[PDB]
Every structure is written in structure tokens, then in C-alpha cells.
Design an enzyme around this catalytic site. Structure first.
Site, PDB file in Angstrom:
ATOM      1  N   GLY A  21       0.792  -1.198   0.000  1.00  0.00           N
ATOM      2  CA  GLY A  21       0.000   0.000   0.000  1.00  0.00           C
ATOM      3  C   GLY A  21       0.830   1.256   0.000  1.00  0.00           C
ATOM      4  CB  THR A  27       4.909   2.897  -2.238  1.00  0.00           C
ATOM      5  OG1 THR A  27       4.214   3.950  -2.901  1.00  0.00           O
ATOM      6  CG2 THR A  27       4.261   1.589  -2.577  1.00  0.00           C
ATOM      7  CE  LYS A  47       6.084   4.157   4.962  1.00  0.00           C
ATOM      8  NZ  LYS A  47       5.576   5.116   5.980  1.00  0.00           N
ATOM      9  CG  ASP A 139      -0.215   9.519  10.552  1.00  0.00           C
ATOM     10  OD1 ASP A 139      -1.406   9.782  10.598  1.00  0.00           O
ATOM     11  OD2 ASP A 139       0.307   8.967   9.591  1.00  0.00           O
ATOM     12  NE  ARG A 143      -3.676   6.814   8.404  1.00  0.00           N
ATOM     13  CZ  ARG A 143      -4.453   7.692   9.021  1.00  0.00           C
ATOM     14  NH1 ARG A 143      -5.739   7.433   9.238  1.00  0.00           N
ATOM     15  NH2 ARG A 143      -3.934   8.849   9.393  1.00  0.00           N
ATOM     16  CG  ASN A 144      -0.150   4.972  10.835  1.00  0.00           C
ATOM     17  OD1 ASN A 144       0.097   4.231   9.930  1.00  0.00           O
ATOM     18  ND2 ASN A 144      -0.172   6.259  10.707  1.00  0.00           N
ATOM     19  CG  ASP A 157       3.800   4.583   9.544  1.00  0.00           C
ATOM     20  OD1 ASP A 157       4.913   4.248   9.127  1.00  0.00           O
ATOM     21  OD2 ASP A 157       2.757   4.301   8.964  1.00  0.00           O
TER      22      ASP A 157
HETATM   23  N1  LIG Z   1       5.512  -3.557   8.556  1.00  0.00           N
HETATM   24  C1  LIG Z   1       4.366  -3.759   7.727  1.00  0.00           C
HETATM   25  N2  LIG Z   1       3.944  -4.990   7.421  1.00  0.00           N
HETATM   26  C2  LIG Z   1       2.858  -5.201   6.631  1.00  0.00           C
HETATM   27  N3  LIG Z   1       2.164  -4.187   6.122  1.00  0.00           N
HETATM   28  C3  LIG Z   1       2.544  -2.900   6.391  1.00  0.00           C
HETATM   29  C4  LIG Z   1       3.638  -2.660   7.197  1.00  0.00           C
HETATM   30  N4  LIG Z   1       3.778  -1.303   7.292  1.00  0.00           N
HETATM   31  C5  LIG Z   1       2.826  -0.716   6.597  1.00  0.00           C
HETATM   32  N5  LIG Z   1       2.077  -1.682   6.066  1.00  0.00           N
HETATM   33  C6  LIG Z   1       0.908  -1.547   5.179  1.00  0.00           C
HETATM   34  O1  LIG Z   1       1.387  -0.891   4.037  1.00  0.00           O
HETATM   35  C7  LIG Z   1       0.461   0.053   3.607  1.00  0.00           C
HETATM   36  C8  LIG Z   1       1.032   1.422   3.666  1.00  0.00           C
HETATM   37  O2  LIG Z   1       1.411   2.004   4.928  1.00  0.00           O
HETATM   38  P1  LIG Z   1       1.550   3.489   5.057  1.00  0.00           P
HETATM   39  O3  LIG Z   1       2.550   4.070   4.014  1.00  0.00           O
HETATM   40  O4  LIG Z   1       2.124   3.762   6.414  1.00  0.00           O
HETATM   41  O5  LIG Z   1       0.236   4.222   4.787  1.00  0.00           O
HETATM   42  P2  LIG Z   1      -1.066   4.362   5.678  1.00  0.00           P
HETATM   43  O6  LIG Z   1      -0.942   3.686   7.029  1.00  0.00           O
HETATM   44  O7  LIG Z   1      -2.210   3.717   4.934  1.00  0.00           O
HETATM   45  N6  LIG Z   1      -1.426   5.980   5.859  1.00  0.00           N
HETATM   46  P3  LIG Z   1      -0.370   6.859   6.836  1.00  0.00           P
HETATM   47  O8  LIG Z   1       0.544   5.940   7.710  1.00  0.00           O
HETATM   48  O9  LIG Z   1      -1.142   7.784   7.696  1.00  0.00           O
HETATM   49  O10 LIG Z   1       0.543   7.698   5.887  1.00  0.00           O
HETATM   50  C9  LIG Z   1      -0.717  -0.145   4.495  1.00  0.00           C
HETATM   51  O11 LIG Z   1      -1.554  -1.088   3.911  1.00  0.00           O
HETATM   52  C10 LIG Z   1      -0.165  -0.692   5.668  1.00  0.00           C
HETATM   53  O12 LIG Z   1      -1.149  -1.478   6.265  1.00  0.00           O
HETATM   54  O1  LIG Z   2       8.238   4.909   7.551  1.00  0.00           O
HETATM   55  C1  LIG Z   2       8.634   4.757   8.683  1.00  0.00           C
HETATM   56  C2  LIG Z   2       9.493   5.869   9.285  1.00  0.00           C
HETATM   57  C3  LIG Z   2      10.476   6.481   8.437  1.00  0.00           C
HETATM   58  C4  LIG Z   2      11.266   7.506   8.951  1.00  0.00           C
HETATM   59  F1  LIG Z   2      12.181   8.060   8.166  1.00  0.00           F
HETATM   60  C5  LIG Z   2      11.105   7.945  10.280  1.00  0.00           C
HETATM   61  C6  LIG Z   2      10.143   7.352  11.110  1.00  0.00           C
HETATM   62  C7  LIG Z   2       9.319   6.322  10.574  1.00  0.00           C
HETATM   63  N1  LIG Z   2       8.394   5.702  11.468  1.00  0.00           N
HETATM   64  C8  LIG Z   2       8.544   4.313  11.793  1.00  0.00           C
HETATM   65  C9  LIG Z   2       8.846   4.076  13.169  1.00  0.00           C
HETATM   66  C10 LIG Z   2       9.066   2.781  13.596  1.00  0.00           C
HETATM   67  C11 LIG Z   2       9.018   1.716  12.688  1.00  0.00           C
HETATM   68  C12 LIG Z   2       8.742   1.939  11.334  1.00  0.00           C
HETATM   69  C13 LIG Z   2       8.506   3.282  10.863  1.00  0.00           C
HETATM   70  N2  LIG Z   2       8.202   3.589   9.436  1.00  0.00           N
HETATM   71  C14 LIG Z   2       7.279   2.707   8.694  1.00  0.00           C
HETATM   72  C15 LIG Z   2       7.949   1.718   7.799  1.00  0.00           C
HETATM   73  C16 LIG Z   2       9.331   1.634   7.753  1.00  0.00           C
HETATM   74  C17 LIG Z   2       9.941   0.699   6.921  1.00  0.00           C
HETATM   75  C18 LIG Z   2       9.160  -0.133   6.126  1.00  0.00           C
HETATM   76  C19 LIG Z   2       7.773  -0.060   6.160  1.00  0.00           C
HETATM   77  C20 LIG Z   2       7.167   0.875   6.997  1.00  0.00           C
HETATM   78 MG   LIG Z   3       3.736   6.872   4.341  1.00  0.00          MG
HETATM   79 MG   LIG Z   4       0.775   3.948   7.888  1.00  0.00          MG
END
Ligand SMILES: Nc1ncnc2c1ncn2[C@@H]1O[C@H](COP(=O)(O)OP(=O)(O)NP(=O)(O)O)[C@@H](O)[C@H]1O
Ligand SMILES: O=C1c2cc(F)ccc2Nc2ccccc2N1Cc1ccccc1
Ligand SMILES: [Mg+2]
Ligand SMILES: [Mg+2]
Ligand SMILES: O=C1c2cc(F)ccc2Nc2ccccc2N1Cc1ccccc1
Ligand SMILES: Nc1ncnc2c1ncn2[C@@H]1O[C@H](COP(=O)(O)O)[C@@H](O)[C@H]1O
Ligand SMILES: [Mg+2]
Lengths: 309, 300
Positions: A21, A27, A47, A139, A143-144, A157
Site C-alpha cells: 500500500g 509506498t 518503504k 499520526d 491504520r498505524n 509510523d
Molecule cells: N511492517 C508492515 N507490514 C505489513 N504491512 C505494512 C507494514 N507497514 C505498513 N504496512 C501496510 O502498508 C500500507 C502502507 O502504509 P503506510 O505508508 O504507512 O500508509 P497508511 O498507514 O495507509 N497511511 P499513513 O501511515 O497515515 O501515511 C498499508 O496497507 C499498511 O497497512
Molecule cells: O516509515 C517509517 C518511518 C520512516 C522515517 F524516516 C522515520 C520514522 C518512521 N516511522 C517508523 C517508526 C518505527 C518503525 C517503522 C517506521 N516507518 C514505517 C515503515 C518503515 C519501513 C518499512 C515499512 C514501513
Molecule cells: Mg507513508
Molecule cells: Mg501507515
């Protein structure tokens, strides 16, 4: 920082496999880590940031990244690694169960009072830890919160928004109006997050444009009581949304209150079919944990190691 | 009285075997998936399907032992997680993708440093000591019976299996008293530990190569022992030779072994002489924190 906490990856070390997502800033992919000189492929979440960044911007990200990698609590996700490509990639643990919002929506007819209260308690514990660490999330939302196992959820996040600086419908009024972000503003987000769970993933203020939210809040409008909630739960949510930020509950208090409720869940939540919902069981829990959730789950004070010299 | 909550009793519907990983004297091991009720996520597991079908009466015995196998709690010992009482019984444990230590050392024969080798020795001794504390005799300690969780972390496996099911015989790993009298003790395990260390130090060579198994007790009785591996300083060899003393009580104890190997692990290049050791990969905190967070979150 303790640098050893954050792995700096080579591009050759990992690969993005499938988009899971996208969010505000990037992404997220299901991916694989391929340790150098080894046959094994290890699942990871990756990410990739939406916008390409300069080296100076990267330095800011890296410096923050060390702090994110420093968290150590069962209810908070740790940032594991970074790859400083033109478009920055970050690595964390992959959660096959996905985010809590998607989970509750997908399981909406099969989730009981015990799980919901337990999740509330856990989210509070994680948020409390971040507070103790002086880290504001900015945030927090359903979702987080990530589902490690159905019995175990973790906050994710945090810190991202400040770094790359809008989830208006989760934001405290002072945040929308003045860009004030504090732990007390996180508490507001916590209330909204609980409301999301309690409604099995409904959208807050659904149909009301984000630009208009601050106006209604100012007139005292709030999210309504979810049908499953007794007044005891709903009152806490309302407290989370008080104008005087110092008047809102503390995460430390929330842990205690939700813990008390979790001891008699059907007293506090009224859910169709609750009598027949699955409840978390020790044999089941032990199994999940032994397989893929081995971290100590005890509160620090209740851990075997607390006083052990 | 083992806490039965430690062993999950599985229905055949809960899980499935998906791929062969290897085999042993008593069964075949598969990569499996557990699918939790009411969920769509599939969770990797290891499953051993026993070679021979068993009766309901025997199954009670296996099950009884399984509770004990499920009760182990040590970072260096594998724990039995589940069982399915199918006609050919199936046992479930955590998947360890790195496989067994012997294969690992053979595959990495030319890029393993002294620090890893000594650390493995220490960790194996730690698990064995724990088994001793629990009053459990392994009976089949060997490099093949040590699994690799990560390259930095190894865990003992297959303890108690031979006693439970046995009527294949690892003669080349067995203490003399075991060969002659079928006596198995913590002290006989110690002998096997010595052999296991020899396997590691040789990067997986076969003990007593060129000597048939039926002839081993004869050579042992005459004082022959495994040779000094070229990497080993005499200090390491002396400990190995101690493991093989005829008098079981004269042999070192695992708790002693932990201390001696830990000492050595402190200044590894002193104790092992390896070509280009100075250029070998060393365990580092960074690689370790990442591995642990991804795949090895247990308390250490
Ligand atoms: N460590 C993870 N394992 C599996 N899915 C994840 C993980 N981290 C994020 N996701 C999923 O990946 C997608 C994107 O996450 P994310 O970029 O944080 O956007 P978001 O939660 O939908 N909105 P936001 O966090 O407020 O910007 C979502 O479907 C999450 O559920
Ligand atoms: O994207 C971030 C992130 C990036 C950043 F430069 C600063 C703070 C963050 N918060 C965070 C805090 C603790 C765990 C993960 C995260 N994740 C989500 C994530 C990271 C890597 C892959 C998928 C999702
Ligand atoms: Mg994001
Ligand atoms: Mg998120
Ligand atoms: O096979 C056994 C086992 C079977 C048994 F009936 C008695 C004792 C055993 N030892 C043991 C002890 C501690 C952990 C695992 C095991 N494993 C390995 C394994 C089990 C299940 C799947 C793959 C491999
Ligand atoms: N838990 C496990 N995870 C991954 N591979 C395993 C596991 N247990 C055993 N194996 C593999 O299966 C082979 C045989 O197991 P065994 O029958 O116990 O001797 C081992 O050498 C490993 O390659
Ligand atoms: Mg076997």
C-alpha cells in the site's frame, strides 16, 4: 545514537516483491532480505519514499532514523534499516496480519470484547512508552497500528510526519489550528483510534470534508457513541477530545482504566454474538509466540528479569 | 508435571506439509504452514512425519514424552511445539531456514572464522548444560543435531528421540560405555560433544574416516582417538581429548566446558589458527540486531 541499532543496507541486499500500500509519504512493499553469502531469503517490509531527496535531506532522515531504531517496547515497532538511494528506502519487520484497521474490518463479525479491550490496553502501553521516550507520534490511527498476531498489536509510523513535514480527522484541535503537537495531542488521536476499533473500522466523520472539521470541533461536535460502547468507554473517548489538552487522560492512566475493563469485558462492550466469539487462549498464544512472536511481552515491572542480578 | 499448555495438539486440518527439507533416522522433515482458525494468514512451521506408523498405546508414550520436549526453555535448546496424532505421527516445531550446523559449516567451509567456531562451541555447551539441569540425556549429540537459527545463534535438537523410538546407530559419536553396554549418561553426551567439536573444527569432516563402524570400539579400547585438527591449538585439542577419557567421571562437565570455551571465545585467534582469519567476517552488533529483529527475537 547507538548506530548498531540501524542497519545501513546495500541495494544488492534486498528486493521489493509486491506493493502492500501507499500512505502520505511513500509506498510500502513486501520484500526480501538476502544476507550476503547466504542461501536464505528473509521477509521484510520496505518503504520507498515518494519524493527523491538530497544528501542533506538524507542526513536529516538518517539522524531521525537512529532514534526510531532505538525503541524497545513490545507494543511499538522498531525501525530496522535504511538504504540511502536517491529515493530513500526503509526496512522494518513484515507483519503478514497487516494493519489493525484492515484486520477489524475483515474480521468485523468475529471480534469479541476481550480482543478489543486488549488492543486498547496495548496501544496505550505503546503510546505511554513513546511518551516516556519523548517521542510524539503525530499520526496515530488504526491504520498505524500493526497486527503482529491477533493477540498482539504494535504502534507504527511515529516521527515520520515531523520529519518529512494531513490526517485532519485524527488530529487534536490545537494541532489543526496551530500546528501544536504534543503527547496530549496524541491522546486525542488515541480516542479517534479507539472509536475506529469500536466501530469495527468505520471512517470518522464520514462524508464531512477535512477542511470543515475544525469548525465543527470548535462548536463542540464530536464523534458519536459507537453502538457497542457502554458509557464507561465512551466517556474516556470524550475525555480524549477535550479542548484543554492538559485535561485529557494520560496514556499511563488509560493503561490502568482499559486494563480494569479488560478484566470484565462484557460489562463494558455490548457486542452481537460476544458469547460465542473466540477468546485468546494460552495454548494458542504460546503456539503463535513460539513460532513467530518470541519477544518478551511482560510489562517491565512484571518481567522475570526486572530484579534479577 | 509438565504444563500441557506447552504442547499444542493439532488437527490435520490446521496445517499442511509443503516441501521436503531433509530426513533422519526416525522421520522426514518438511516445511509446513499452519493456518490458524478464522485467519487467512499462513504461518511457516517445521513438521516431522515419523517413518513408522504407531499404535494408540504407543501414541500415549510419544505424547507423554512430547510434553517433556515442549517444556524446555533455553535459548540454546529447540522446543517441541505441537503434535498431530495421525496414523503416522506428525510433530511440529519452529522453522529454521538455515538448516543444520553440519551442512552449514560444510557449505561455508572456506569463510568461517575463529570467533564463530568458538561461539558455536560455547552455545552448544550451554544447551547441553541446560539439558543436564533438566535431567535429560540427548543420546545423539552431533553437528547434524544442532540447528542454526541465525549464523550467530545455534540450538540443540533431537534430544530424547532415540530413547523414545529407537530399536540408526551413531557409533562414531558414541562413548565407549554406550557402545559396549548401552549406558547413556550426561557424561556419554560429553563424549559426543567432543566429537561434535571435532566436526566443527574440521569444517565438517567425517570422524574415523576409513574405519568401519564395527571396528570402532576396538580402536577406542586400544587408546586411539580422533586426530588434532590443523586449526586447533593444543589447548583446544586437550579439551577434546578429555571428552574421550574412558572413565566417564574424569571427563569435563558441560558447565566446565562453557567456561573454558567462553575463555577461548574472548581471544579466538589465540586458540584457533585459521588462514586469513584476520579477513573473515566477524559477528557484529549491527548484523546481530538486524537478524534478531527479523528472525530471532527470543531473549538471550
Ligand atoms: N511492517 C508492515 N507490514 C505489513 N504491512 C505494512 C507494514 N507497514 C505498513 N504496512 C501496510 O502498508 C500500507 C502502507 O502504509 P503506510 O505508508 O504507512 O500508509 P497508511 O498507514 O495507509 N497511511 P499513513 O501511515 O497515515 O501515511 C498499508 O496497507 C499498511 O497497512
Ligand atoms: O516509515 C517509517 C518511518 C520512516 C522515517 F524516516 C522515520 C520514522 C518512521 N516511522 C517508523 C517508526 C518505527 C518503525 C517503522 C517506521 N516507518 C514505517 C515503515 C518503515 C519501513 C518499512 C515499512 C514501513
Ligand atoms: Mg507513508
Ligand atoms: Mg501507515
Ligand atoms: O523430532 C524431534 C523429536 C521427536 C520426538 F518424538 C521426541 C523428541 C524429539 N526431539 C526434539 C526435541 C526438541 C525439539 C524438537 C525435537 N525434534 C525435531 C523436530 C520436531 C518437529 C519437527 C521437526 C523436527
Ligand atoms: N526445525 C527445522 N527447521 C528447518 N530444517 C530442519 C528443522 N529440523 C530439522 N531440519 C532439517 O531436516 C534435517 C533432518 O532433521 P532430523 O530428522 O531431525 O535429523 C535437518 O538436517 C535439517 O536439514
Ligand atoms: Mg529423525
Amino acid at each position: 545514537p547507538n548506530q548498531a541499532l540501524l542497519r545501513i543496507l546495500k541495494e544488492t541486499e534486498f528486493k521489493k516483491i509486491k506493493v502492500l500500500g501507499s500512505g502520505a509519504f511513500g509506498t510500502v512493499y513486501k520484500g526480501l532480505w538476502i544476507p550476503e553469502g547466504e542461501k536464505v531469503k528473509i521477509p521484510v517490509a520496505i518503504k520507498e519514499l515518494r519524493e527523491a531527496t538530497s544528501p542533506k535531506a538524507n542526513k536529516e532522515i538518517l539522524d531521525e532514523a537512529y532514534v526510531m531504531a532505538s525503541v524497545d517496547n513490545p507494543h511499538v515497532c522498531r525501525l530496522l534499516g535504511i538504504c540511502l538511494t536517491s529515493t530513500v528506502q526503509l526496512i522494518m519487520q513484515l507483519m503478514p496480519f497487516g494493519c489493525l484497521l484492515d484486520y477489524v474490518r475483515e474480521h468485523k463479525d468475529n471480534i469479541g470484547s476481550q480482543y478489543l479491550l486488549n488492543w486498547c490496553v496495548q496501544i496505550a502501553k505503546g503510546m505511554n512508552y513513546l511518551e516516556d521516550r519523548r517521542l510524539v507520534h503525530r499520526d496515530l490511527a488504526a491504520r498505524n497500528v500493526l497486527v503482529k498476531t491477533p493477540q498482539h498489536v504494535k504502534i507504527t509510523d511515529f516521527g515520520l510526519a515531523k520529519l518529512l513535514g494531513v490526517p485532519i480527522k485524527w488530529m487534536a484541535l490545537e494541532s489543526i489550528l496551530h500546528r501544536i503537537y504534543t503527547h496530549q495531542s496524541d491522546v486525542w488521536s488515541y480516542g479517534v483510534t479507539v472509536w475506529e476499533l469500536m466501530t469495527f473500522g468505520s471512517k470518522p466523520y464520514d462524508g464531512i470534508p477535512a477542511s470543515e472539521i475544525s469548525s465543527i470541533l470548535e462548536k463542540g461536535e464530536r464523534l458519536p457513541q459507537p453502538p457497542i460502547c457502554t458509557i464507561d468507554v465512551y466517556m474516556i473517548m470524550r475525555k480524549c477530545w477535550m479542548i484543554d489538552a492538559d485535561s485529557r487522560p494520560k496514556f499511563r492512566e488509560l493503561i490502568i482504566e482499559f486494563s480494569k475493563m479488560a478484566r470484565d469485558p462484557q460489562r463494558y462492550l455490548v457486542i452481537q454474538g460476544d458469547e460465542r466469539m473466540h477468546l485468546p487462549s494460552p495454548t494458542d498464544s504460546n503456539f503463535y509466540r513460539a513460532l513467530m512472536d518470541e519477544e518478551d511481552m511482560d510489562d517491565v515491572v512484571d518481567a522475570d528479569e526486572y530484579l534479577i542480578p
